[PDB]
Design a protein around this nucleic acid. Structure first.
Ligand SMILES: [Mg+2]
Lengths: 49, 49, 200, 209, 236, 215
RNA sequence: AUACCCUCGA
């Protein structure tokens, strides 16, 4: 279940079933903002959750 | 699908001119086509010396 | 200089579109000369400042230097003399070179991404040779065969063919017209079909 | 806001009945709007007079064969179509032509009827007919309501307009209306343009302020 | 003109420009804002350290970075015809060289971001553990609750230890120098962003090999419109 | 030479409207309709956001902590604002919100002469730590004015001041008990709601009057 | 501001 979302990162609470004993919910997804590509085009990711 | 969407089954209908405002005698084809923009911009091609 | 070409359907056969920036860069010494002659600039630094600022009065002098100064346009592979012809440039708003639709056949140039190099003749000999030997109007017939090369291509041929067809029964069939003017008057008023068997 | 309202209109007179009106500074879309509106007004809605019916004695049907003139009936009708006649008295008059070379001036006339071009030839002899003149709006074909003939009421013969790019100092991207006219000669093309503009202005003068 | 008004085919182009501090024979060139014979407005666009502030509109010929090489100017300026907005500046300094103020600010921002990331990561897990422990025991036997409290405290302490160790490791992985080329004291690069609008001359295409160069952009009125009044967007 | 009086306007919704002009001479329907369509679709004065700057932003190619959309999307959402100006032409509006929630056009600072039509226009979504405080300068113009045609931290927006979206017309017969040769024009006008259809028709009428008065 | 290599357009 997604814990917190913003234009920069996504934090996911990992399900207790699909997790080890300790440190249950840890999945921090850092979205890459406007970044130069090899062809000088922008590479940015947007949240959809 | 076209007859279900209340559009002409042939996919064509007579358009109205944009300047004179008179209907074209024969019906033309209009629809939504996935158009692309390629990395061949005239901004990078215009050179002058 | 060079840029992508673009069809200009509002161009006469002898002229071609030319972007403001390309024309301003190519004819820079001519602009400097006219600016000094008119006295609008005293030192060449001032002239460069005006031409780089694109002050509204520099467009007038640019129009004056462009008025009767033909330019040369050629495609990348020039397989015959027709592949480079002289055009009398007209200033346009953009970055692409506008071409007359009827010269595309001679250039073997469609508008799917083609580019054209533009060259500015300088000497009066060069300008007169451009206007008298390689102006676009001079070379209508192909040098390979007397048959014309500046001829209606796909779209205009389609239009002319559709105009001069005949329908067995159409609106406006039968009556007689006193002149071509009356035919135009009846057609534009919508009382006669474009292709209807009539008498005139 | 404020628009570009040109006032340097010029009318290049290329012939007595032909003229080319130009209008250099105009906004991007106004050239086509004005040109199309004026063309539709001139060609369709412009009051005038023309012959609508003719009764040539001895011609029962349109495709009849007649004797005494070099040409035939349809040529006579086409020649009659080009007559430019102004009706100052009434909106209805019938004129007669009697001759046994026929020209427009050979038609007898009253104080009301005025033939602009009396030299317009009609027939060539080696002709007792009466024709009906009426007032109308534009091009009215005989089919849409010898005894019938297509009527060209509008005073203009041909209207065409083109728009070309006009260069302003810093705008540089505008359009220039070149409108060419040709009337029968009953009205000066400048007068025809003024009449068309006046009519179109009257069409929405109620709400302008 | 709708396709430009609705801004459908505009694209963002990011380009970079670089400057290298060479070990010049007379002396090293320094990244300083006191460019000799420099005008005021251009210096106003620049900062005290000699680098354009991030988020500044830049016209052609403007001075993005200031380098003085013995004093001659190797300052970076944008190429002719290139105008855009500065979105990011990166600074690399050779090992054993002084870390400038801008690099310090960039680094402190980076460690602030890292610190807040592991702070919230600790926060979520510690909240989960605390509410699990509170739900396990009855509303506010005796040995079990104390044992669970001790276990939760030990787990929180271990998480804090590993988290701070990771933070320090990231910190020291940030403090290190770069393996720049020989004769490179400081390397700087700026990034420019351009919103390229579609204009006559741009190549457009479909998916079936139907190329095309956009010719003109007519207003909405001239394009053919349906009987309902909706206007077409492209005429092929 | 009949002329229309008492411009008839029918309101279908806040945006879509119908305008009918009953008395019109034969053949004048298409001419008047196309002229009005071109005039409306081309030149109609409207107001739209032209400058926006936020406290925590430097350039439009960045993101804001706790805001679900980046600055480009925020500006694109702002571009669809349907505002109405009654007094002066340039005004400045504020928008400050913190905490979780959804910022809409309702949360824009109100004013005396400034009105919001689409108060349901979502601009951005906020998280618990999300907080944005931004200022909107709007201006009234006529046509599409890009940023190039028009300090650090101020963001320039492409503005399309045209408030009209779709114009349609149909010409049907009009029976005034005089003759069956008359006809009427029905303008199916759909805007963004910032301008009244009667006002749009009158402004088009004056514009056409002036452009004809050039003769 | 010199030579190869790669990729792309007509
Ligand atoms: Mg090709």
């Amino acid at each position: 279940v997604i814990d917190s979302v913003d234009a920069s990162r996504v934090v996911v609470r990992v399900a207790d079933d699909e997790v080890e004993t300790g440190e249950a919910g840890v999945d921090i997804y850092n979205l890459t903002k406007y970044t130069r590509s090899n062809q000088n085009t922008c590479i940015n990711q947007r949240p959809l959750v | 699908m076209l007859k279900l969407a209340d559009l002409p089954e042939s996919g064509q209908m007579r358009l109205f001119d944009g300047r004179t405002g008179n209907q074209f005698e024969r019906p033309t084809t209009v629809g939504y086509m996935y158009m692309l923009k390629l990395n061949h911009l005239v901004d990078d091609k215009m050179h002058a010396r | 200089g060079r840029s992508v070409i673009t069809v200009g359907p509002t161009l006469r056969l002898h002229q071609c579109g030319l972007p403001k920036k390309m024309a301003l860069e190519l004819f820079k010494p001519f602009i400097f000369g006219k600016l000094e002659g008119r006295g609008m600039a005293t030192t060449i630094k001032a002239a460069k400042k005006m031409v780089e600022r694109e002050l509204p009065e520099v467009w007038d002098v640019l129009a004056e230097v462009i008025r009767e100064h033909p330019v040369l346009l050629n495609r990348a592979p020039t397989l015959h003399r027709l592949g480079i012809q002289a055009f009398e440039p007209v200033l346009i708003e953009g970055k692409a070179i506008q071409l007359h639709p009827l010269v595309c056949a001679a250039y073997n140039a469609d508008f799917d991404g083609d580019q054209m190099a533009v060259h500015v003749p300088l000497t009066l000999e060069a300008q007169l040779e451009a206007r008298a030997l390689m102006m676009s109007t001079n070379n209508i017939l192909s040098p390979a065969n007397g048959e014309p090369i500046i001829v209606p291509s796909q779209d205009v041929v389609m239009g002319l063919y559709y105009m001069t067809r005949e329908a067995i029964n159409a609106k406006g069939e039968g009556m007689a017209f006193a002149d071509l003017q009356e035919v135009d008057r009846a057609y534009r008023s919508g009382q006669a079909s474009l292709h209807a068997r009539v008498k005139v | 806001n404020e628009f570009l309202t040109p006032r340097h209109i010029d009318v290049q007179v290329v012939s007595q009945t032909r003229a080319k009106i130009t209008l250099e500074p105009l906004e991007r879309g106004f050239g086509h709007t004005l040109g199309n509106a004026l063309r539709r007004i001139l060609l369709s809605s412009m009051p005038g007079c023309a012959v609508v019916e003719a009764e040539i004695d001895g011609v029962l049907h349109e495709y009849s064969a007649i004797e005494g003139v070099q040409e035939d009936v349809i040529e006579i009708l086409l020649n009659l179509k080009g007559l430019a006649i102004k009706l100052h008295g009434r909106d209805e008059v019938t004129l007669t032509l009697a001759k046994k070379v026929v020209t427009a001036a050979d038609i007898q006339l009253d104080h009301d009827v005025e033939i602009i071009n009396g030299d317009h030839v009609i027939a060539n002899l080696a002709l007792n007919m009466k024709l009906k003149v009426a007032r109308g709006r534009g091009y009215e074909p005989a089919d849409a309501r010898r005894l019938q003939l297509d009527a060209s009421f509008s005073p203009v013969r041909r209207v065409s307009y083109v728009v070309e790019n006009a260069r302003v100092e810093q705008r540089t991207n505008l359009d220039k209306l070149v409108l060419d006219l040709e009337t029968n000669g009953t009205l000066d093309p400048e007068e025809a343009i003024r009449r068309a503009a006046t009519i179109l202005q009257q069409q929405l003068a109620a709400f302008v302020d | 003109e709708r396709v430009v008004q609705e801004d459908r085919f505009t694209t963002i182009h990011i380009q970079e420009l670089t400057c290298v501090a060479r070990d010049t024979k007379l002396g090293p060139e320094e990244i300083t804002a006191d460019i000799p014979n420099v005008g005021e407005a251009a210096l106003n666009k620049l900062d005290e350290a000699g680098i354009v502030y991030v988020g500044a509109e830049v016209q052609a010929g403007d001075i993005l970075v200031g380098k003085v090489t013995p004093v001659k100017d190797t300052s970076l300026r944008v190429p002719t015809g290139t105008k855009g907005t500065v979105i990011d500046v990166q600074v690399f300094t050779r090992d054993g060289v002084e870390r400038d103020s801008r690099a310090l600010s960039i680094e402190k921002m980076q460690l602030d971001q890292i610190r807040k990331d592991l702070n919230e990561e600790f926060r979520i897990v510690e909240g989960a553990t605390f509410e699990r422990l509170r739900a396990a025991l009855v509303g506010a036997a005796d040995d079990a609750l104390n044992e669970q409290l001790e276990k939760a405290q030990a787990y929180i302490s271990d998480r804090r230890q590993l988290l701070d160790d990771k933070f320090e490791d990231k910190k020291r992985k940030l403090q290190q120098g770069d393996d720049l080329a020989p004769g490179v004291l400081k390397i700087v690069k700026v990034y420019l962003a351009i919103k390229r609008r579609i204009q006559p001359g741009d190549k457009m295409a479909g998916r079936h090999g139907n190329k095309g160069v956009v010719s003109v952009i007519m207003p909405v009125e001239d394009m053919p419109h349906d009987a309902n009044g909706t206007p077409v967007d492209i005429v092929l």
